[PDB]
Write a protein that binds this DNA or RNA. Structure first.
Ligand SMILES: *O[C@H]1[C@@H](O)[C@H](n2cnc3c(=O)[nH]c(N)nc32)O[C@@H]1COP(=O)(O)OP(=O)(O)OP(=O)(O)OC[C@H]1O[C@@H](n2c[n+](C)c3c(=O)[nH]c(N)nc32)[C@H](O)[C@@H]1O
Ligand SMILES: [Mg+2]
Ligand SMILES: [Zn+2]
Length: 1930
RNA sequence: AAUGCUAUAGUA
RNA sequence: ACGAGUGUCGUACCAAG
RNA sequence: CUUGGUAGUACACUACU
């Protein structure tokens, strides 16, 4: 109701006003106070300002466009010289910044491990290996620094000959601190392979030098005795990458590694991956299986597996190391050992592990040495070599542990489908990259993407990027090798750009069959020798960025780096940036007039698009609803609190360690690390802050009554003026890039205001086509493809139009004439700009958002005032430096020279820095996107004006994201060379970006002819493309470590996403197998391990155990990609159907097969199936095993996992929360919890929700603290600690198994059962439950029939017939055709149960009369599953046995009810996003067919034929059925049947066929006769006049309306045009009106003549008749540049030009045309071009249709969809696509040998191209053959049509991307369907006869007859597999 | 081909 | 030694002789 | 240096999809 008058007095607003010119100030002040309603019109203020600024906008546009002539095509083109100069500058800069070392002894280990081949002779017993190690160590020869220490250690761990004593002592210790060592001869044993130091066997000097220098244990000065000294200032030291000697050494090291590791192990390769998924991998691809087996046979795999296993052992043995005890770790290899030197307990804070590898090799030079060796020593038998000491943390140890999966994935990705790549090189590169855990390779993997991409681009500034940004960090030799590889790739990229060639594009005006880049291995590989395709080249470029490990950054240094960056930007802005508005494109300035004009135009368009925008914003963002309902306001994310939190931080004397802050007393005190107390006391102006969860902060605000129960938008508005100071902290994202980014965190107050403003911006941004932030996920990939397709079109027809007459003259010519005519023609140009913006938020002008807010017409003046006040306050926000950063800074003792942090903090006087110009990253995404889209619109306008100056053609599409820009530009012109156009476009892109306060990152921006690069997505030439390998790498890489099932679920979801992006089937199976193997390793579940569940369940192998119970996945790959994580149960049920169902019903529909599940006997079921069905029924449907103690869990926290291990619980984090104290004190109350429990029992709505009101939300959040799942969710848990806990404590109880329904020094993650006794408990409880036929009926009824999607997928697996292979030429994106017909529940499961709890379907946020259907479905589930009756019985029996009601038990039961209801409703929700398929689907049948075809064989994709109506939506068809629904269904049915009848059937037999269809067929599960009755009774009978004539002869009423609706001008098309946009078909057109009728006859680009049968001959009626006739929706563009020579007299059609391409068509005389054109010749020249000639005659107005006449006129023709309604007028039926023809159902139609029902069911033979059928395969034609005793094939083909068909024609498009287009033409007489079938039969039968001969004599030879008899018998005996039928048929 | 107001692991 | 770094860090901590 | 005691995650992790 009230504004904020204090806004006009804000200093920020005053500066903004003074910066502006005087009239603009008045305009802004008027716009702020302008209101929509009280004004006469809503679009009056925007119009005023737009008119005011139009002059300046137009002058700027014209001046920018005029630069086209001043552009000389010397654009920034990369070449060899640019790369060389940039490399020299980079070398100089790197030398200046970092110290360069030329000595090889300065290298860091490339891989922190050394390996040698195993010894077959020596056994694998631990004691024998230990004795051998001791003897080898004691036998070292020679002299060195540490040889004495190593000999002494060998003496210490030597056990002599008392092997039996050692074994029995170790067993005794393992049978069960201050462990006492027994003197085993010379050893001092405390445990298995652990030895205490022996001062008697070693010199003290040797021990000190080993533990101080070699290992670094205690070598430092403890940071207290290190005062003002030993602090060495030095630059980072790296090797010389460009040095010839260093590169030679690196190459030698790589060669040695290749030489040794290539040798085979010499053993049979067997492992989990093989034994589980080998068959599936081999079926998907044999080459992938061969490559994987060869990998398993090599020494690389054994090396990496040994390293992983040894590291897993090292981490396990490091828990209880003493100060003077060193342990020994072993592995599978009997020659590789590690010594774990004493260190801290590794599960503590930032604890590291110290180890040194020992390798025993018979010969020297037999040791894989990746720069980690310390020395090889000769000893007894062979040599012994020991590596340098290695210290690593937990995250690096994790990566090293999860190495083999990454190695295998990388090797299989690089090698896949490439025979010219040597596998050893790939495996060498992969083993060196995957084992990298250092920043060196991480500093090269990311920049290489940009370097090679900009080198390959048409134009780029790669020289600058190399000179300034590229900075290799070469501390290892492999880093030098990779740097040389990158340099060579950058050199080669330019030379091989021309080696990319486009594929032959196929056009149909509705779809593009073929597109993309040609598949020729011409490009040179990057990381290793060989040749690669463009897709493989891009994969090699982009994949290595995902090799990087996450969390390799160290907090001590990265926090300082981020603070330095932010403060440097801030100080540069403070000291150099003063002006705001600039017209010279100054940096960090905005042009005012242009910005205002563009904003006004875009706002006008957006508001004009939708009338109701304010409401759209209010409703979609819960503006009118309470704050508790909004999700982001109730999340568990972090939030900032500013106040007095001294006590909390203090809970967790010494000197401050900083000379500046030391007082007199502080001098005489010990130095110590800064904590909160010393920081607070010393630092005068320190603001105190803490971080608490968002929901906890909201609860605290509700307690203090800051926020009430008023609608959120009202609450946000009052706080915009109630909050005046903003504080923001920051932390490090921990990303995997070279430089980590900073993440800004703000308080709850700022959060809500930013939420409101950005929702306002977002709802407007969703109304524009440019911004891609609005779409979710891979929706962008679909858009990119659509834009590419439309540009490709526009280019094709524009180039054809501009050069059609030139090409015609060239054809008529056929040397010198060809040259000049080719010179004088338009040139097609396609340019793609892949642009990024540098420092999108840091160096961004924030004053344009003021104008954006002020010009918004959907806001009241008070709202504008409050939002502007909020923005002004935001400009005064202060960044709070984190306490850890202050601790680092205050612990220096040496003053940094250019200390920017101290400079900006008043010498660390305060921890707040006033950040003004920088709006923090991630806060203003949508406003920035809108402004960037406005800038792109300005750029588009400039480009259009410039192209108009050249009189060319333009098409600009600018994809917009937050800071990622994709601008694609298509130009057709003939005035100047293309290079000048490219230079002009790039310069104006710079100018347009600068005019709006942005700047394009040319240092990372590049331009290509074909490649589209939007955000992480590719579109080569309209073919969607993506690097799917990143999903596999991420799945194999970072893990949550939360639990065995959810880990596997995340891995399988990543595999599913990769499949969606085009992963070949074999690599997906490899990824799934690797995921299962890694999950088994993490929890010790391999065959024979501790937690192997195969012996605890009635299952033959792991394939028969559900994933939830730690089984392996068994499902078809196409089925997994469709749903995922429910495929196991679905496949199990499908297998049960395939087995038990009777033979009669097996190839029936899945519903029909389920219909006889009652006939099944429950007794004759195997144990495994009974167990799995009990699992399904009870656990999935009516949960009886609680996965945890479900005490405070809402109806949201149930997954599918049954055995969920407990996780960490952090006492400190909970004690931080303000609501946790309330929960504890309420729990401390004598009976407080019971009152809350019974209050919830009285209000069960709070279980599903979290409390719509204030008080109920308070109670719900208090109650949720009892769950111990929500408690452990708020806890701090890191993958590293969880991984080390899993690998350390495997026997600890971690699982809480309460059972069916219900029934000191404790660790943090203690549980109830030990993960193994849980199997026994689960099986025991399952034995109690019983199974009946009703239970099975419920399981099939719900998991399958409830969802149409499940019925459909099971239908796909039952009715599938695999067909002919064919190449993957053009890929396309199709999401899910007719989704709504497959969705059971409309709304989200949260809303459905929300409307179920409150017994009212009218809940806010949902749709009434749609909640009705959903609640009906839900209620149905509860009723048929007895979900309520069983709960009531249980409650009654519990109360009876107890004798009094139990609130807790009732709460548990009710929570379980809502929880299983939520799980059931969520199970019916499927989120299937965009897919990449070898074609684009038209129906669900086509989509499923494409999926199955693409997801079987990697090399080729097949075509599948669902035998019996796969969709089978019997219940769904009843749902969503309406009057118009049936009427639309009938229209499509009859269009399809008529067009099929006259397109494929012989004309003389078309009537009987139509009658047979209309009598005994059905469409969409609807009888056809009913549809015909609908057609006859419908009003629009005229649309099917030919059909009504051919059948039933219904007339006189349709005909009268047909000659009657000519009241408005009606247009008919006597013959359809073969190409509508390319202008290439026979055209016959007729337009009829009042006493007027014109008929147009022409072919392709030439119009022959036009007959005008006008009523009167006067030359005045002719013009009015012409304009009236040609002004109708004829659809003939009249763009036929076939201008006709003019003859005196007569009349010509001509088309004048009207702007916006609204050409006006008129009829004119010769003399009039000539006179007007000569008059207009006087000094844009618009000339009327006469096209076609007009014949004028006088005719009467008599009616032209009589029912009797039709039979005579139509006697000659026999066409069902077309009849001659007049002599030259044809009545026609609208066409429809033939993809819908599958929905037809009926008995086979027997036309001799041919069966027409299977023909019309066939999709490959329904094509209208003679060539596509003449060149088909027998397999496609086989399904048609139905012999019935026939021998002659010709008898059958007589029924096929003999009308001429289309044949493809090839043309060359003249454009800078050279490509050829292939389209259809009319053809000839001999090109008929029957001729094509005859040729196909002859060719394919000959080929089949020669293919299956395998006999000396021939095909019909008796021996071959017997062989074919054996083949058909094999099938007549073996069960019908996927491909048996086609062999028999052919 | 399509057309109903609520259409509801990743990116910087 | 190793990790990190053109920011001083980690390189276990405390008590006693 | 020698003999004893201690240590569960760098207690931190956002804004939009
Ligand atoms: O499913 C769509 C379309 O994809 C599919 N289809 C097109 N071509 C097909 C084919 O060759 N074989 C099969 N099996 N399916 C084919 O059928 C549906 C489109 O049918 P169609 O009837 O061709 O679509 P129209 O746009 O022509 O529909 P209509 O409502 O008649 O459009 C009127 C609108 O377009 C002008 N018009 C009509 N016709 C026939 C032409 C023409 O031949 N050339 C030009 N230049 N314009 C035409 C009407 O005058 C008006 O402007
Ligand atoms: Mg980009
Ligand atoms: Zn036969």
């Amino acid at each position: 109701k009230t504004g904020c008058p204090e806004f006009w007095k804000h200093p920020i607003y005053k500066e903004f006003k003074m910066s502006m010119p005087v009239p603009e100030r008045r305009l802004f002040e008027e716009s702020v106070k302008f209101n929509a309603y009280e004004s006469e019109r809503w679009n009056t203020n925007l119009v005023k300002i737009r008119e005011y600024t139009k002059k300046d906008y137009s002058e700027h546009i014209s001046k920018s466009a005029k630069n086209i002539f001043l552009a000389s095509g010397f654009y920034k083109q990369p070449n060899k010289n640019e790369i060389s100069e940039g490399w020299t500058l980079m070398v100089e800069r790197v030398q200046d910044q970092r110290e360069i070392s030329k000595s090889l002894h300065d290298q860091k280990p490339s891989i922190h491990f050394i390996w040698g081949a195993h010894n077959p002779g020596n056994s694998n017993n631990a004691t024998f290996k230990l004795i051998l190690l001791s003897k080898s160590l004691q036998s070292i020869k020679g002299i060195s620094t540490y040889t004495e220490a190593f000999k002494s250690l060998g003496k210490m761990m030597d056990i002599g000959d008392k092997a039996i004593e050692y074994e029995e002592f170790c067993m005794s210790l393992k049978s069960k601190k201050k462990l006492e060592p027994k003197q085993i001869n010379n050893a001092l044993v405390l445990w298995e392979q652990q030895f205490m130091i022996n001062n008697d066997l070693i010199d003290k000097s040797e021990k000190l030098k080993l533990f101080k220098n070699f290992c670094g244990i205690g070598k430092h000065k403890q940071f207290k005795n290190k005062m003002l000294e030993d602090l060495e200032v030095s630059k980072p030291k790296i090797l010389d990458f460009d040095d010839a000697n260093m590169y030679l050494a690196s190459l030698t090291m790589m060669e040695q590694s290749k030489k040794i590791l290539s040798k085979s192990n010499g053993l049979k390769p067997d492992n989990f991956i093989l034994n589980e998924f080998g068959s599936r991998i081999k079926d998907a691809n044999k080459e992938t299986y061969d490559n994987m087996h060869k990998i398993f046979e090599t020494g690389y795999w054994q090396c990496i597996s040994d390293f992983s296993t040894l590291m897993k052992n090292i981490l396990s043995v490091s828990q209880y190391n003493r100060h003077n005890t060193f342990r020994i770790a072993m592995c599978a290899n009997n020659n590789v050992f590690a010594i774990v030197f004493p260190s801290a307990d590794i599960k503590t804070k930032k604890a590291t592990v110290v180890y040194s590898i020992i390798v025993l090799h018979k010969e020297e030079e037999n040791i894989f040495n990746p720069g980690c060796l310390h020395g090889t020593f000769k000893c007894m038998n062979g040599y012994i070599s020991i590596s340098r000491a290695i210290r690593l943390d937990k995250e690096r140890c994790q990566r090293i542990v999860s190495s083999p999966g990454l190695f295998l994935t990388t090797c299989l990705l690089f090698k896949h489908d490439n025979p010219t790549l040597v596998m050893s090189d790939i495996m060498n590169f992969s083993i060196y990259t995957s084992l990298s855990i250092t920043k060196s390779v991480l500093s090269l993997t990311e920049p290489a993407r940009y370097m090679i991409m900009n080198s390959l681009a048409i134009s780029s500034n790669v020289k600058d990027y190399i000179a300034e940004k590229f900075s290799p960090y070469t501390k290892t030799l492999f880093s030098v090798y990779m740097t040389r590889l990158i340099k060579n790739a950058c050199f080669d990229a330019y030379d091989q750009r021309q080696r990319v060639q486009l594929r032959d594009i196929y056009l149909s005006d509705y779809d593009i069959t073929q597109k993309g880049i040609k598949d020729n291995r011409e490009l040179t590989s990057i990381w290793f020798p060989g040749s690669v395709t463009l897709k493989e080249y891009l994969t090699q470029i982009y994949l290595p960025f995902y090799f990087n490990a996450k969390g390799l950054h160290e907090k001590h240094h990265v926090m300082v780096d981020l603070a330095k960056t932010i403060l440097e930007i801030e100080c540069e802005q403070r000291e150099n940036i003063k002006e705001i508005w600039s017209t010279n494109c100054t940096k960090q300035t905005v042009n005012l007039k242009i910005l205002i004009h563009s904003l006004c135009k875009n706002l006008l368009a957006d508001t004009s698009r939708h009338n109701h925008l304010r409401n759209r914003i209010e409703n979609r963002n819960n503006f009118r609803r309470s704050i508790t309902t909004i999700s982001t306001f109730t999340s568990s994310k972090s939030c900032l609190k500013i106040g007095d939190f001294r006590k909390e931080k203090e809970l967790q004397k010494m000197r401050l360690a900083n000379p500046m802050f030391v007082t007199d007393e502080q001098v005489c005190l010990e130095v110590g690390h800064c904590n909160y107390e010393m920081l607070r006391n010393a630092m005068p102006n320190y603001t105190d802050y803490i971080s608490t969860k968002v929901f906890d902060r909201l609860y605290e605000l509700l307690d203090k009554k800051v926020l009430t129960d008023k609608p959120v938008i009202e609450q946000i508005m009052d706080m915009m003026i109630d909050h005046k100071k903003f504080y923001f902290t920051f932390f490090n994202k921990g990303q995997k890039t070279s430089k980590d980014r900073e993440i800004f965190v703000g308080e709850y107050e700022a959060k809500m205001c930013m939420y409101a403003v950005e929702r306002i911006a977002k709802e407007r941004c969703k109304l524009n086509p440019d911004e891609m932030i609005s779409e979710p996920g891979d929706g962008k990939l679909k858009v990119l493809e659509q834009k590419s397709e439309q540009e490709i079109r526009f280019l094709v027809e524009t180039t054809r139009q501009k050069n059609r007459e030139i090409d015609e003259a060239i054809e008529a010519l056929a040397l010198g004439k060809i040259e000049k005519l080719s010179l004088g023609k338009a040139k097609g140009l396609k340019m793609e700009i892949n642009a990024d913006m540098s420092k999108w938020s840091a160096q961004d002008v924030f004053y344009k958002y003021f104008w954006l807010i002020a010009l918004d017409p959907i806001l009241y003046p008070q709202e504008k005032e409050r939002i502007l006040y909020f923005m002004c306050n935001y400009m005064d926000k202060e960044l709070i430096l984190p306490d850890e950063l202050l601790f680092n800074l205050l612990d220096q003792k040496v003053a940094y020279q250019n200390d920017i942090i101290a400079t900006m903090t008043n010498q660390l006087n305060s921890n707040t820095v006033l950040i003004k110009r920088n709006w923090l990253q991630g806060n203003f995404n949508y406003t920035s996107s809108y402004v960037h889209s406005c800038a792109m619109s300005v750029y588009k306008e400039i480009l259009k004006e410039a192209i108009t100056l050249l009189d060319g053609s333009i098409l600009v599409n600018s994809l917009v994201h937050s800071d990622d820009n994709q601008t694609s530009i298509t130009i057709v012109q003939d005035k100047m060379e293309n290079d000048k156009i490219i230079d002009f476009a790039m310069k104006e892109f710079e100018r347009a970006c600068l005019t709006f306060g942005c700047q394009a990152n040319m240092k990372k921006t590049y331009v290509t002819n074909c490649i589209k690069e939007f955000v992480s997505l590719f579109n080569l030439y309209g073919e969607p493309f993506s690097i799917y390998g990143r999903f596999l790498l991420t799945s194999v890489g970072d893990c949550a470590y939360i639990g065995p099932y959810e880990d596997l679920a995340s891995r399988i979801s990543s595999a599913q996403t990769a499949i969606k992006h085009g992963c070949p089937p074999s690599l997906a199976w490899v990824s799934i197998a690797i995921s299962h193997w890694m999950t088994s390793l993490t929890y010790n579940m391999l065959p024979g391990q501790s937690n192997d569940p195969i012996d605890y369940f009635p299952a033959e192998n792991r394939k028969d155990i559900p994933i939830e119970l730690n089984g392996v996945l068994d499902a078809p790959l196409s089925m997994i990609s469709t749903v995922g994580l429910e495929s196991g149960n679905l496949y199990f049920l499908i297998k049960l159907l395939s087995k038990y169902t009777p033979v009669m019903q097996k190839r029936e529909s899945v519903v029909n097969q389920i219909a006889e599940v009652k006939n099944w006997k429950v007794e004759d079921l195997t144990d495994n199936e009974i167990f799995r069905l009990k699992i399904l029924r009870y656990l999935v449907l009516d949960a009886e095993m609680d996965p945890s103690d479900i005490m405070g869990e809402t109806s949201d926290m149930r997954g599918r996992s049954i055995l969920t291990p407990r996780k960490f619980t952090t006492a400190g984090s909970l004690r931080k929360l303000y609501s946790f104290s309330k929960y504890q004190d309420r729990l401390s109350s004598p009976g407080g919890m019971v009152e809350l429990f019974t209050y919830l029992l009285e209000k069960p709505e709070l279980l599903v929700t979290k409390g719509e009101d204030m008080k109920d939300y308070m109670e719900s959040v208090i109650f949720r603290y009892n769950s111990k799942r929500f408690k452990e969710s708020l806890s701090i848990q890191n993958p590293a600690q969880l991984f080390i806990e899993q690998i350390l404590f495997s026997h600890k109880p971690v699982i809480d198994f309460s059972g069916i329904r219900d029934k000191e020094k404790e660790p943090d993650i203690l549980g109830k059962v030990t993960f193994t006794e849980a199997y026994r408990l689960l099986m025991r409880d399952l034995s109690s439950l019983e199974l009946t036929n009703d239970d099975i009926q419920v399981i099939y009824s719900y998991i399958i029939l409830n969802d149409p999607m499940m019925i459909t997928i099971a239908n796909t697996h039952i009715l599938s017939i695999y067909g002919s292979p064919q190449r993957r030429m053009g890929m396309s994106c199709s999401t899910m055709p007719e989704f709504r017909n497959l969705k059971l529940i409309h709304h989200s499961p949260a809303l459905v149960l929300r409307a179920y709890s409150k017994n009212n379907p009218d809940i806010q946020g949902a749709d009434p009369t749609e909640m009705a259907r959903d609640l009906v479905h839900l209620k149905e589930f509860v009723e048929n599953t007895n979900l309520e009756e069983k709960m009531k019985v249980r409650i009654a029996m519990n109360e009876a046995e107890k004798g009094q009601r139990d609130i807790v038990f009732e709460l548990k039961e009710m929570t379980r009810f809502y929880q299983v209801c939520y799980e059931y409703v969520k199970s019916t929700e499927h989120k299937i996003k965009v897919f990449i398929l070898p074609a684009k689907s038209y129906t669900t049948t086509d989509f499923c067919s494409l999926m199955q075809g693409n997801l079987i064989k990697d090399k080729e994709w097949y075509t599948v034929h669902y035998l019996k109506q796969i969709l089978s939506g019997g219940h769904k068809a009843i749902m969503q059925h309406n009057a118009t629904s049936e009427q639309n269904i009938a229209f499509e049915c009859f269009k399809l049947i008529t067009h099929f009848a006259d397109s494929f059937i012989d004309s003389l037999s078309r009537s009987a066929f139509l009658q047979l269809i209309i009598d005994e067929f059905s469409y969409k599960d609807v009888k056809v006769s009913k549809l015909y009755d609908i057609i006859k009774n419908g009003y629009n009978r005229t649309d099917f006049i030919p059909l009504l004539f051919r059948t039933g002869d219904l007339r006189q009423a349709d005909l009268d309306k047909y000659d009657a609706m000519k009241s408005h001008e009606r247009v008919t098309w006597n013959d359809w045009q073969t190409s509508r946009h390319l202008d290439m078909g026979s055209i016959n057109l007729t337009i009829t009106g009042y006493n007027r009728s014109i008929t147009i006859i022409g072919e392709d680009n030439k119009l022959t003549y036009a007959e005008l049968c006008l009523t009167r001959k006067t030359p005045e009626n002719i013009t009015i008749s012409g304009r009236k006739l040609l002004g109708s929706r004829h659809g003939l563009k009249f763009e036929n540049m076939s201008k006709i020579q003019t003859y005196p007299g007569n009349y010509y059609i001509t088309y004048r030009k009207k702007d916006r391409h609204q050409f006006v068509y008129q009829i004119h005389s010769h003399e009039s045309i000539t006179r007007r054109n000569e008059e207009h010749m006087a000094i844009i020249y618009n000339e009327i071009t006469p096209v076609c000639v007009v014949n004028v005659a006088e005719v009467d107005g008599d009616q032209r249709i009589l029912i009797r006449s039709l039979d005579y006129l139509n006697n000659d023709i026999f066409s069902l969809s077309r009849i001659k309604v007049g002599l030259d007028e044809f009545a026609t039926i609208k066409k429809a696509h033939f993809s819908k023809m599958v929905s037809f159902e009926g008995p086979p139609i027997k036309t001799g040998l041919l069966d027409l029902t299977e023909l019309m069911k066939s999709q490959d033979l329904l094509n209208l191209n003679y060539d596509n059928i003449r060149n088909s395969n027998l397999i496609s034609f086989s399904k048609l053959i139905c012999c019935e005793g026939s021998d002659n094939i010709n008898d059958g083909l007589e029924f096929l049509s003999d009308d001429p068909m289309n044949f493809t024609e090839g043309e060359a498009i003249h454009s800078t991307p050279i490509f050829n287009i292939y389209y259809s033409k009319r053809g000839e007489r001999h090109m008929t369907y029957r001729n094509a079938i005859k040729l196909l039969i002859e060719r394919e039968t000959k080929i089949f006869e020669e293919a299956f001969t395998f006999s000396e004599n021939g095909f019909i030879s008796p021996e071959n007859l017997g062989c074919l008899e054996a083949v058909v018998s094999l099938i007549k005996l073996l069960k019908t597999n996927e491909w048996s039928t086609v062999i028999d048929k052919c």
